[PDB]
Amino acid sequence: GSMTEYKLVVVGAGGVGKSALTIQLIQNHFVDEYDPTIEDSYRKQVVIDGETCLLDILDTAGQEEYSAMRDQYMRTGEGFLCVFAINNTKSFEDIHQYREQIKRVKDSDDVPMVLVGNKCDLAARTVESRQAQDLARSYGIPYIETSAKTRQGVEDAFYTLVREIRQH
Amino acid sequence: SSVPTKLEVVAATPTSLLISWDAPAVTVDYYVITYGETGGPVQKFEVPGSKSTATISGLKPGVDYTITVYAWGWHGQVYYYMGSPISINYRT
Ligand SMILES: Nc1nc2c(ncn2[C@@H]2O[C@H](COP(=O)(O)OP(=O)(O)O)[C@@H](O)[C@H]2O)c(=O)[nH]1
Numbered sequence: 001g002s003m004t005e006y007k008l009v010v011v012g013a014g015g016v017g018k019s020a021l022t023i024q025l026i027q028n029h030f031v032d033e034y035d036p037t038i039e040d041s042y043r044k045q046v047v048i049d050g051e052t053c054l055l056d057i058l059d060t061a062g063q064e065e066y067s068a069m070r071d072q073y074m075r076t077g078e079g080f081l082c083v084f085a086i087n088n089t090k091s092f093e094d095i096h097q098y099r100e101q102i103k104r105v106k107d108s109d110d111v112p113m114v115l116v117g118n119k120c121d122l123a124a125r126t127v128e129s130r131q132a133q134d135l136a137r138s139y140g141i142p143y144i145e146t147s148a149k150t151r152q153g154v155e156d157a158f159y160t161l162v163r164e165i166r167q168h
Numbered sequence: 169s170s171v172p173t174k175l176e177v178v179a180a181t182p183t184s185l186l187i188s189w190d191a192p193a194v195t196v197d198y199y200v201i202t203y204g205e206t207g208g209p210v211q212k213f214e215v216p217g218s219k220s221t222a223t224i225s226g227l228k229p230g231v232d233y234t235i236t237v238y239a240w241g242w243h244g245q246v247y248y249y250m251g252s253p254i255s256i257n258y259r260t
């Protein structure tokens with residue numbers, strides 16, 4: 001439509017909280033269910049730095065990693081949240097392949113992207129902030145620690161990505 | 169506002185520069201320094217946030233360079249460079 005709209009794609013290993021982050025952002029509650037309904041897109045009008053806009057959150061949960069659908073989400077997306085869980089080391093190790101996939105799909109070394117360390121409400125993390133800080137600095141992108149449970153950092157993560165899209 | 173502030177070349181040789189800047193009040197994790205010929209890839213390195221000087225070596229004499237300093241640190245839950253990065257132009 002005519003109202004300013006940002007297409008934000010959430011990627012990351014299964015179980016890191018892509019869907020929980022999305023539902024917390026848009027619907028203001030925390031989901032921890034065995035079999036929830038996840039929408040292909042969630043939209044909401046917000047104000048970011050004085051700008052009224054629509055966010056369209058495209059959650060890639062449930063898609064196969066190399067599926068055409070996953071490719072389609074990456075091609076339509078304007079910016080990406082690359083999410084890992086701070087208590088799952090494998091999910092952090094997966095980040096590299098997601099970033100490289102997005103770069104190749106966009107055919108660009110510079111795609112709007114943020115790194116998100118989710119579940120920051122949890123006690124006993126396995127990925128220290130330092131490791132993620134150094135990774136984000138090497139990528140030249142923002143890093144945000146978030147909790148889909150408490151909402152800590154959640155707006156920061158998505159709004160920081162909008163700011164990256166703007167300056168692209 | 170620029171972060172850091174007052175970036176300047178304080179000493180030089182035909183192939184090298186010593187740069188200095190003024191740290192902000194906030195805690196900086198690392199400063200990332202980039203430099204490239206103003207007639208355009210950029211080279212990059214970093215120094216810890218406890219330091220506010222750097223040297224740049226291996227430059228071409230008589231060539232204009234664009235030098236930019238980025239102050240990476242926390243702002244609440246967001247870790248990124250803070251404020252607006254500061255840049256100067258300089259020719260040895
Ligand atoms: N404590 C905590 N649990 C979370 C957080 N985000 C997600 N979860 C839980 O992690 C599990 C997987 O989350 P989900 O959103 O389904 O992950 P997805 O596969 O990446 O979409 C669920 O049990 C969520 O309730 C968080 O920030 N904190």
Ligand SMILES: [Mg+2]
Pocket residue numbers: 014015016
């Ligand atoms: Mg899941």
